[PDB]
Amino acid sequence: NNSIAIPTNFSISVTTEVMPVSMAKTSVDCTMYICGDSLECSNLLLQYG
Amino acid sequence: VLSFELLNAPATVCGPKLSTSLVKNQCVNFNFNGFKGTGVLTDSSKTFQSFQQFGRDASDFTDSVRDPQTLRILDISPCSFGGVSVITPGTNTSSAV
Ligand SMILES: *[C@@H]1O[C@H](CO)[C@@H](O[C@@H]2O[C@H](CO)[C@@H](O)[C@H](O)[C@H]2NC(C)=O)[C@H](O)[C@H]1NC(C)=O
Ligand SMILES: *[C@@H]1O[C@H](CO)[C@@H](O)[C@H](O)[C@H]1NC(C)=O
């Protein structure tokens, strides 16, 4: 109840902190993934247009 | 009763059809022993076995095929090439892109 610790010296420390900000922007073409450049499939994809 | 099988082997029994000329670096639809598709035919430097006919990609998409007359190697690429973006202003202002 009558004891206290007081520092007598110090130090300077440099630390790292790594945080992500963005990811890779991606785009997807419906044709050339569902219908592989075929005319018969591209006439059926319009119903799912 | 007749039994058929279709493998990566040279064909023995074939239907009556007359071969045509070979066109390269163009968007055409081909027919190699009944395998009909659409792509750009290019000369290829890949090496096959002594019996195999068409190679395959990672997604089971045939991209190389051997013509049964020249017995050489051809490469198939899609007619559509890459992604194309269009930059436009508003249509009420102009129509130049
Ligand atoms: C705190 O600690 C540092 C070392 O980290 C001490 O710095 C020294 O100070 C003396 C003179 O006081 C110099 O001659 C030395 O070169 C310094 N560096 C080292 C590495 O010894 C400093 O004195 C300390 N402060 C205190 C005890 O009050
Ligand atoms: C017939 O097939 C052979 C062997 O594949 C080939 O060399 C030749 O060009 C083909 N055509 C004719 C007209 O002989």
**Calpha distance B47→A18 (Å, rounded):** 48
Quote the tokens at residue B97: 């892109």
CA–CA distances in Å: residue A22 to residues A16, A17, A25, B2: 19, 16, 9, 61
Q: What's the reported resolution, in angstroms, to a tenth? A: 3.5
**Calpha distance B43→B67 (Å, rounded):** 11
CB contact under 8 A, A37 and B38: yes
**Calpha distance B69→B11 (Å, rounded):** 12
The residues pairing with B77 across neighbouring beta strands, listed in sequence order, are: B40
Protein residue with its CA nearest to atom 11 in ligand 2? B69
Quote the tokens at residue A8: 């007598």
Experimental method: cryo-EM
Could you tell me if B30 and B39 are in contact, meaning their C-beta atoms sit under 8 angstroms apart?
Answer: yes
Min Cα–Cα distance to chain A from B54, Å: 18
Quote the tokens at residue B65: 């095929």
Q: Quick one: which H or E segment has residue A41?
A: helix A39-42
Please count the helices (runs of H) and the strands (runs of E) in chain A. Answer: 1, 0
**Calpha distance B27→B61 (Å, rounded):** 17
Nearest-atom index, ligand 1, CA of A11: 5
E strands along B13-72, which residues? 27-28, 31-32, 35-36, 39-43, 54-55, 64-66
**Calpha distance A47→A33 (Å, rounded):** 16
Q: Can you tell me which residue has the tokens 């963005």?
A: A22
**Calpha distance B52→A40 (Å, rounded):** 28
Q: How many of the other CB atoms lie within 10 Å of CB of B27?
A: 14
- Give the 3-state DSSP-derived string for chain B, with helices as H, strands as E and coil as C: CCCCCCCCCCCCCCCCCCCCCCCCCCEECCEECCEECCEEEEECCCCCCCCCCEECCCCCCCCEEECCCCCCEEEEECCCCCCCCCCCCCCCCCCCC
Ligand nearest to the Cα of B72, by number: 2
